[PDB]
Amino acid sequence: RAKAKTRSSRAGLQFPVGRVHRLLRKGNYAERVGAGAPVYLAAVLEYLTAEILELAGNAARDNKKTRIIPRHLQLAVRNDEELNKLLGRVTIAQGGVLPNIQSVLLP
Amino acid sequence: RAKAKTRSSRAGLQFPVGRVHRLLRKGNYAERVGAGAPVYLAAVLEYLTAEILELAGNAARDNKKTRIIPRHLQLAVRNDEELNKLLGRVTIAQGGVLPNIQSVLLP
Amino acid sequence: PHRYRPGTVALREIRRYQKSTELLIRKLPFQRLVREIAQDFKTDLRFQSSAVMALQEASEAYLVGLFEDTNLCAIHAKRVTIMPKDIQLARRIRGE
Amino acid sequence: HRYRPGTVALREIRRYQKSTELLIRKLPFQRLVREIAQDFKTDLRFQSSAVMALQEASEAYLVGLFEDTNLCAIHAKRVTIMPKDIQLARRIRGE
Amino acid sequence: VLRDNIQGITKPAIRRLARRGGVKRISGLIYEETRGVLKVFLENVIRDAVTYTEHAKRKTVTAMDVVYALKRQGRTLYGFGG
Amino acid sequence: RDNIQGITKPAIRRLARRGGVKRISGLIYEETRGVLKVFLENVIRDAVTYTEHAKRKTVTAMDVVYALKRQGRTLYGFGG
Amino acid sequence: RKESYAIYVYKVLKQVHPDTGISSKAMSIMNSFVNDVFERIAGEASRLAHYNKRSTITSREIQTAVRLLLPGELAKHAVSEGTKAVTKYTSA
Amino acid sequence: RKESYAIYVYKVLKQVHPDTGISSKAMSIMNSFVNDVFERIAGEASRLAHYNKRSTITSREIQTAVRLLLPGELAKHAVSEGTKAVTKYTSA
DNA sequence: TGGAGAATCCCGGTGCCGAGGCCGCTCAATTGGTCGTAGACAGCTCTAGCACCGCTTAAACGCACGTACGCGCTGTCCCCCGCGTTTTAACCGCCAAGGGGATTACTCCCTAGTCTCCAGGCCCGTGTCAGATATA
DNA sequence: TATATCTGACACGGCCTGGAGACTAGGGAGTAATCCCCTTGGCGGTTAAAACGCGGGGGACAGCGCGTACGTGCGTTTAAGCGGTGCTAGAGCTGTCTACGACCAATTGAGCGGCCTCGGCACCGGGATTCTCCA
């Protein structure tokens, strides 16, 4: 047998192709799972994770903190319209709400 | 051999136990399906079919119609609280709306 | 001559269109609207007739439910007239 | 040196909208959860994480409901929220 | 090329849909907002239906695609298959 | 018993301040208590059903997460 | 060829309302209702089996799926006829 | 042996925000987010397989699921990233 | 308070087409037997949830003052409803091309299954840095 | 906003199990071909509905008075909350066995496609009953 190379390194990803393939196989979705489906879904999950972490890090530097807390994730999700559409039925614990006051209540 | 007895007949049901069993196997729900699961599911489906059909026949008899139309099914579902809770996210085609004028609009 | 008060004809129309189950939007303009919406996504696209009636039934039901919530918003503001802020309030509360 | 009616409410809004801490005391919510769960199954054990999950979900639901209630109140040309606003919001949301 | 057929959703048609919902009086600014609401909803359904058709390598949008598109967004329609 | 009164008036006021409500009527609190009771009854009944299917006498946070996911109220950060 | 509940809903209608017929569109709506409720209960039972690390959908999973999905009196009754049906199937 | 996506979110976070850490509750949230998006996309891919009478999940099914679920720019960039990963896997 | 144009309800005749009953058959449900394995059940650990006392202290509760605000009344004017006339595009029928859905043969590449091997992720331990506290 | 301190969560550093390499087999789906439902473009009458316009009436909207009921501050109560200890239900892991469900094969009758029929119901026309507006 030759040297063992991981399937995530062949696709240039950090998310596991093999774990995603195993979760697709035991999750009872279809009778068969193709070769490119775990690669594709690992790439999609890596991109969505990257987008959430970029906006969370920007929100963390906006509050002068170098560690991401749930409040930074909530400010990351709900200030972007696409992630608000994706996570509209999702409650983030210890996330709070964005500060909005309607204009009729201002003095 | 012996006489071929239908599984729905020995369970006292009209809905097909074997068809529900086939659809449970081929529907990619779990690796195994128990023996009592299609009997239970056919019993629940037959009960819900009977509950909609009895109220639809009552609505057809109240409108002096021999025959159940989609308006009768809508009048059966939306006038009962439990069936409207079950089918609140579902639109019946050619079903119309219940007669409900608000009190402030009537003279 | 004979002239009805404002509201009696509207209430008779409410009773007629709540008793009936017919489609109220004309079929051919809805078909043309569906095709011009679908031509922005994929060119040279056909439609089954039952797809167009399914779209018409879903659209009519959604608009009737939106108008029910709009009427409740208009009654909440001590009015009997529906105005666009009632529609915007109903869609904001639903989450659209 | 009494403040105007409304400015302490506005500082309360800006204080509780900038915070993540739960606004309900933990022990009354524990007693309420156990009292409700007694009606479904007698002598249930409860994890602490389950009660914290219930409190977080209930607080988020009530905050969203009060936002919709405030929207109904401004739609009725009014600052004070009333039970009819809550009822209208739950009726439009489907409850 | 079909252009500007949103005016085919006429003012009496919107009035009839409001009469079905139990509306006594309608302001004259309602109809443009109703046309916009209907257009937004129709693009939301039709984009998913065209996606379902394109996955099957078909050129005709069927009633199955519309039923699955409405079932996806929680607006399930009975009577057109399922 | 009588544990709905533990959800006090300042707690409902605090939750309304988080929602951006500037002025609160005196009849908000009973309605908020009833709304919270209905929501907790639904989620707790579903979590109890999830627990009694698992042959357990302890309501795990997984059961609460799945109960909220059944109602489209997905909760993040509690092992979901 | 095409498979649907075109004869069992009529059987239930005849044993409930023996002098009442059904139209084609209403029967298609009833078939869609049966398929939708079947999909809901089967998906809930599969999700319950996956939550408890089980590879089998038993009668207990369908029972708790019916208790989860249906409202109160409907769930209590459907549990009662389901239990009666499995009891009659096992006893005969 | 509870499997989690913690080290992968470490790797992505250090890839794009090198001088930025993360908390434990934020990782519980991120783990739930990855699991939720995975379950959503895989369930839609299963539905796409069952609608077209298919028994396998390919890259086309995941592509169509990503186009159905994710909003516009998110769907476009996710499809681009997945297609790049698939052609990098196939070419190497 | 009572009468008239108009809508509404009720009843009888007519035609139609669509559900509904019946038959051939084929295909999927039924029966019979085998085997492996998922799960039922007992045992044991030790995690964690309930129970309770002290205290000190933040949070809640009651009371009083008062001013912003809800709410009702009035006026106005304008905008939408009601209805007559016109025009215009929907609708139905029949109609042909002709693109594409749906079925069938085949054949091949793709993916399940299996054995082996090893290295990546995971539990545990440690120490060190990022916020919260503290004060002006 | 600026200057010191503390602490507790967090990033880094041996075994085991699951992911990868190589091979085999078989079956699902791609490709080609064909056949016919069914989809669209179009002509033409027609008549129903959309559009336009005019009067008018009722209701959206603005202003104003008033009476009251939440907001706010302060003093007193009370029980959340943290620490600490104790103890016992029961969550969870492991081992063993046994019933039960997948699987394969032969049989057979249940349900579906196809076809013929008759009455339920929409439609038309006439008569009785409100019904809503106005003097």
Numbering used by the authors:
A (entry chain C), B (entry chain G): 11 to 117
C (entry chain A): 38 to 133
D (entry chain E): 39 to 133
E (entry chain B): 21 to 102
F (entry chain F): 23 to 102
G (entry chain H), H (entry chain D): 30 to 121
What are the paper's exact sentences on this?
The engagement of a DNA glycosylase with a damaged DNA base marks the initiation of base excision repair. Here, we report cryo-electron microscopy structures of nucleosomes bearing a deoxyinosine (DI) in various geometric positions and structures of them in complex with the DNA glycosylase AAG. The apo nucleosome structures show that the presence of a DI alone perturbs nucleosomal DNA globally, leading to a general weakening of the interface between DNA and the histone core and greater flexibility for the exit/entry of the nucleosomal DNA. Mechanistically, local distortion augmentation, translation/rotational register shift and partial opening of the nucleosome are employed by AAG to cope with substrate sites in fully exposed, occluded and completely buried positions, respectively.
To investigate how AAG acts in positions with different solution accessibility and histone microenvironment, we sampled different superhelical locations (SHLs) and rotational orientations on nucleosome, and a series of single DI-containing DNAs with a DI located in various geometric positions (–30, –50, –53 and –55) were prepared. –30 at SHL-3 and –50 at SHL-5 both represent solvent-facing positions with high solution accessibility, whereas –53 and –55 at SHL-5 represent occluded and embedded positions with medium and low solution accessibility, respectively. In the AAG–NCP–50AP complex, a DI was introduced into the position of –50 at SHL-5, which could be regarded as a roughly equivalent position of –30 in terms of solution accessibility. Subsequently, the structures of apo NCP–50I and AAG–NCP–50AP complexes were solved at resolutions of 2.9 Å and 3.0 Å, respectively. The presence of DI at –50 causes a noticeable movement of both strands away from the histone core: at –55 to –45 (–50 ± 5 positions) of SHL-5, the calculated RMSDs for the DNA backbone are 0.8 Å and 0.9 Å for the damaged and undamaged strands, respectively. Globally, the buried surface area between the DNA and the histone core decreases from 7134 Å2 to 6248 Å2 in the presence of DI at –50, and further decreases to 5977 Å2 after engaging with AAG.
